[PDB]
Design a binder for this molecule. Sequence first.
Ligand SMILES: Nc1ncnc2c1ncn2[C@@H]1O[C@H](COP(=O)(O)O)[C@@H](O)[C@H]1O
Ligand SMILES: Nc1ncnc2c1ncn2[C@@H]1O[C@H](COP(=O)(O)O)[C@@H](O)[C@H]1O
Lengths: 684, 684
Amino acid sequence: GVGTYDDFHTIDWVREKCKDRERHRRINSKKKESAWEMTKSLYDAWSGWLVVTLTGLASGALAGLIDIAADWMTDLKEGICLSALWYNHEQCCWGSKCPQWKTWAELIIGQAEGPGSYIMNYIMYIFWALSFAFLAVSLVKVFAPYACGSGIPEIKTILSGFIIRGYLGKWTLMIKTITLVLAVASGLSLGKEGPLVHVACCCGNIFSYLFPKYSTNEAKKREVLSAASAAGVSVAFGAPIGGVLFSLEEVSYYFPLKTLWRSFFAALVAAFVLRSINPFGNSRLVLFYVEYHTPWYLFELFPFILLGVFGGLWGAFFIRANIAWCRRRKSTKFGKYPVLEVIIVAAITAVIAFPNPYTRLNTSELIKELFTDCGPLESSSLCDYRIPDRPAGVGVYSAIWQLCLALIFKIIMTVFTFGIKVPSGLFIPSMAIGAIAGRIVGIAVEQLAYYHHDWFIFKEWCEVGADCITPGLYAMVGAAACLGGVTRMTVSLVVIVFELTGGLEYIVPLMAAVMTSKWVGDAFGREGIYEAHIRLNGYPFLDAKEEFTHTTLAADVMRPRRSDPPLAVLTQDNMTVDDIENMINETSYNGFPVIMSKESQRLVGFALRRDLTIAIESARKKVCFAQLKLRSILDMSPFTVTDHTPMEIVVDIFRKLGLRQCLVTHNGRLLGIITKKDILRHMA
Amino acid sequence: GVGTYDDFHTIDWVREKCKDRERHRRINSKKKESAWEMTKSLYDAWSGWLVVTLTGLASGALAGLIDIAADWMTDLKEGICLSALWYNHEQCCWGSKCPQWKTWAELIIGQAEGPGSYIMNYIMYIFWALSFAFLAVSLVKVFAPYACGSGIPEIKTILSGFIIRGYLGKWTLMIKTITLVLAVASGLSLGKEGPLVHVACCCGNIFSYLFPKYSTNEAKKREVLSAASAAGVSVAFGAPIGGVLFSLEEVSYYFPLKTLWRSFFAALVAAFVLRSINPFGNSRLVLFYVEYHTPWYLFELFPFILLGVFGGLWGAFFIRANIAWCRRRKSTKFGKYPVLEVIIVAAITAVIAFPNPYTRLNTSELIKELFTDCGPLESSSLCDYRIPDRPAGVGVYSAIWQLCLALIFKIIMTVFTFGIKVPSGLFIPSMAIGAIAGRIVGIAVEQLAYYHHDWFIFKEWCEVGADCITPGLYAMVGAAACLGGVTRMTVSLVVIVFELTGGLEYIVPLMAAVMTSKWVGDAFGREGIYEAHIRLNGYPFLDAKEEFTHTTLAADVMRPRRSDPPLAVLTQDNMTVDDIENMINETSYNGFPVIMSKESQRLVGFALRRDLTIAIESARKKVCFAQLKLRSILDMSPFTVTDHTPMEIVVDIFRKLGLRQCLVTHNGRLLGIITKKDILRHMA
Ligand SMILES: Nc1ncnc2c1ncn2[C@@H]1O[C@H](COP(=O)(O)O)[C@@H](O)[C@H]1O
Ligand SMILES: Nc1ncnc2c1ncn2[C@@H]1O[C@H](COP(=O)(O)O)[C@@H](O)[C@H]1O
């Protein structure tokens, strides 16, 4: 019972490190006594690599299964495959105007064309969208309410030391997997790549419990989960180095500088296991995978910057509009009806996403077609073409018309769709918005070059007889621009994009676009979406970037004040059982310092609520703090800070040593306490 | 005068951070007042990127000039070029049995063959080696005694907070460059890639002084030098990512987690500037550059491990043998004659390195030929060849005979040649030892396959009519094995070997060899060469890996003891000028705590020697610590730690907050102090 942590309170890292040292000393004392002890110590040391290996394996396997099921269910909204009911659209079409794959309209009316067929297909698409959204939201609400959302805002807080009991359990993992598949299939403007960080961390937490070295200790658990988040982003984007950089930058909070190898190994193993999931010989590393072998010119940095500007405004817009909506999702009756919320949102998305062929496609498929340049064989509306460039017809006009509506639709609907009670990600919708913007810009540039190639701006570069601009690169740049504008990631995101879409010729474009998007989004506030949502949920997250603007000291932030009762303290050897029982019943504090005497106020040590209560109960079933005696469980080395200490130092010691509370002493006389809640409240 | 640091002292990072916060507040107060202030603040923020950019530029330029001059003077030992006196051996041989390039023997006797010609060439090679070594060592001894050695053991300490005044000045940089060129040319068993870290850090220190933001502050300077070390390693090996990993792992000690971008940018800029240094169109990224496009088999993983074993023993041997010798270099009259030491060592090296053609070659050229597989046109003794394999004659027997002597010679000489008073590196000689070992193993494997292909072990893999084993791969693996066994680097070294010799097919062999070498070298002690030499020089380096084995508290490490006088302290308002003068004259401490009274021993604050003396001198030219008054320069926030605190916490707070001293308080009563020297001494 002693040394546990209760629900929804932040962790003290120093105590966990001390307990880890105690266990290490216990092991090392026996280590040299016999060879068997050396073998046991080696196994205990390899426990970390075992848990990280299993986390990578599970992340790869679960991401592969999620991708397969999501693809199948997304295709199931548009038709079935009579020859084999367990093949998806692409697999059935490739397995040979196809008679084996039949849409619902052909099944019900028996006619493949006409107003009736379109009506029936529209209705049935709406039906499956509604059914998948219903099943996912209800399953989340009933069996594991923690699966909702991307879960990165919570994983970041958990790695910062926070505690959420079932967030990384087995029911949360199972329901997150199933409901993430169902939600991505439903057609909601959400993703499945951000939520895989939560799945990887769930796997890490589950696999930690197989080793007592990690089950009892918590900081070691945070290290394992930091590796797991790297594995999760790796498997999400297939970018081991990008995943590890994301973990170090966005998610991982505490970094002993040795687990970086563990994070990289976890990412590599996850990517390896995911790559092996290719039963049908797919040629893509990810469902939104594309590569580029075309040039880019210096004048294309003018609009690559412009896209960054877009990525900065939309990002800044999104955090403004989404957070506000999420606010209304809690300060209105809309929050009392989450299943109805998801039903309405999914229905609206399906009704307004079917007419436009770009929004009807799976967002990953949309990102894939937005990264692919127009080939000779392509005759779709996106590449309807009839001099260096190619003449264009009404098809391109209509294509821009449709892409504009797709962009508006997705910008508006991701705002309302991010914070609903079903596993939802933000990487995929943000990339879709950015890619649609980039494709629009690229098509505009291509048409501008074609009509006015005779202008000097293009006369120097564009060569007669060959294509001069590649809109797919513009789309890939806009994806990163918006992704960095919303997440405020700079280098981890750029590495993620580089590994996600192979090719180094576009480091300068991506770098410029991402930097411009972040700098434009910072002019409206330096909050990423995962920090704006951490703020909104009011999670006790000690931001590594937050600055204490007030030029005040630890004097300002102690919270015994003139309007508060006298500081809660403990005497040394005069108090009895009744006094402590009454004080704890009448008070609501997690820990109490121990001092010499009323007139002395000379510090002795620290004690915690849970262990003190446990000891009192044990003593009653079966009071001096000096050398009934509670000497053992008394934290005799509590951190202290002088009132004239400045708040930068207190924040720094909290960040580095992972403090949960620090006493404050004046000339050896105790004054008050400063906990994480105090620093966080006062920082705001 | 207030706030400076004395020579050969250790920086307290917390005070520097507080000063940086004060300056940041000063700037930010004016920042919002006008646009000009915003521009000034933006320039001040860009100061860091400017200094890192200039550090990369200077590292690239200086490494390029050093490489060019080292190549030219290394070739000058063997001949001249009549047509143009400023072209080296390769350039004049390529500029067309060559009549332009003439060796000394043909110039003096006029005959190109015979005993006399060989005698004269041998004598002149010895002469040139002696003269180059003499000039380098004398120039180091006279103009900048700090240029000697690789300088990594000292820079690791400097980035840990230590101060060495002229280590990174302008005379040290100039003399280091010139004498490093001259030493590499001399023919000593040393290198020029480790010392480039010192050149890069010198450049960083020099370029910091151009900005007041970094000149006055020290921790900011430490960040700049951390980036500079990454740039130096990058330019040394042409490996930006490898250089940054080396900086984070080996050299860089304090890591705000934001400068990693600065380190990567510095490395990239250094590599870019170095690559542009190719006036004559050389095809090699580095003078020891080679690439591989051949396979490797699983059975070749046995001796790749074996080389690792070698890399572990030799490494462990070297640190044992070199340190001992370096120890004797201080406990004998040999240390009183450093110029004679270098003369004798260079003379012996030239005398016994000329006869064997493998040791007569520049160690970088030796590493290059050891990395290159035998081509059809090669007729040298290394590849004298007359079934899957190729028949061999007496040439291969003699080649193994010669490579064995080369390995023994290099192993023995690098032991005596590392700690001499002239810029000497250890990457090049260690990689040469490893490459010779790997080439020996590869040739042995190839011959065993040729004679005994009929055995089942090779019958499964080797294909008739084609080569089966590539000794160059074995040499490249052995280089990394020995490099990691001497430096005890695992992942940074592996990335360095990746980027130095392009190709990912060989990750498993390199990783296995490096890990085996480190684990075998750890069985004899977990000290890298740069930590064994830090220990030997007795530098106050707080190792990030050292463990405090004693299960003791902060009480035992207190150094007021029964045999020592009473703790040095100050009274608040009772003492006069005479008392302070006498106490400073009769005592030798850097800082003094301020307490309430003799009978109270209640802490008040902290004071430093230098600023206190400065204030007293100023007061005399033109005594209460309460609210002559010295209130201003009195530190009110000295870190305190209860004696019952355990030493792991003290070590961790020292390593995280960069403490120089921490008081210790007992129930509010001051007891003693714990400085970095105390912890370091007690740790041993
Ligand atoms: N021993 C104590 N005496 C008085 N106030 C306390 C004590 N412990 C905690 N507090 C206050 O109660 C708040 C909530 O406690 P905690 O959950 O420990 O952060 C802290 O932020 C303090 O302001
Ligand atoms: N004011 C002081 N009174 C007594 N010992 C001190 C004081 N300041 C430093 N020391 C000790 O003197 C030794 C050398 O001090 P320093 O070289 O200034 O770190 C260490 O053992 C310190 O703990």
